[PDB]
Design a protein around this ligand. Structure first.
Ligand SMILES: *[C@@H]1O[C@H](CO)[C@@H](O[C@@H]2O[C@H](CO)[C@@H](O[C@@H]3O[C@H](CO)[C@@H](O)[C@H](O)[C@@H]3O)[C@H](O)[C@H]2NC(C)=O)[C@H](O)[C@H]1NC(C)=O
Lengths: 48, 48
């Protein structure tokens, strides 16, 4: 019973941690941002 | 329709539609985030 309760509490903590911390998924947002930069730069170079 | 156009010397190809952009009486052209022309004012009717 203790093990099940600790597990359930930890899962709730995972949801609260991800919900309340905007930076938790930064690695994936960084990948998206790098691809967005690469394409915005490639298009902007056409104006040179 | 997809047409060729020449607007006061501006040459290009595209599909022209009614604009909902709010240009000031002074402004004649619009550009998006990447400095690509995306709006003109008709030289005879002043339609955007
Ligand atoms: C090993 O550690 C666990 C905690 O990780 C101990 O269980 C915890 O025991 C405390 C009491 O010493 C519980 O607090 C009480 O909870 C009841 C809930 O109704 C509340 O009414 C009391 O006023 C008090 O707050 C705590 O909830 C409980 N935690 C879990 C997850 O069961 C366990 O006793 C420790 N074992 C040993 C041998 O030290």
């Amino acid at each position: 019973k203790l093990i099940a309760n600790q597990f359930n509490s930890a899962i709730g903590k995972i949801q609260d941690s991800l919900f309340s911390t905007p930076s938790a998924l930064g690695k994936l947002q960084d990948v998206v941002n790098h691809n967005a930069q690469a394409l915005n730069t490639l298009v902007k170079q056409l104006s040179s | 329709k997809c047409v060729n156009f020449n607007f006061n010397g501006l040459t290009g190809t595209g599909v022209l539609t009614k604009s909902n952009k709010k240009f000031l009486p002074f402004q004649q052209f619009g550009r998006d985030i990447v400095d690509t022309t995306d709006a003109v004012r008709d030289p005879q009717t002043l339609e955007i």
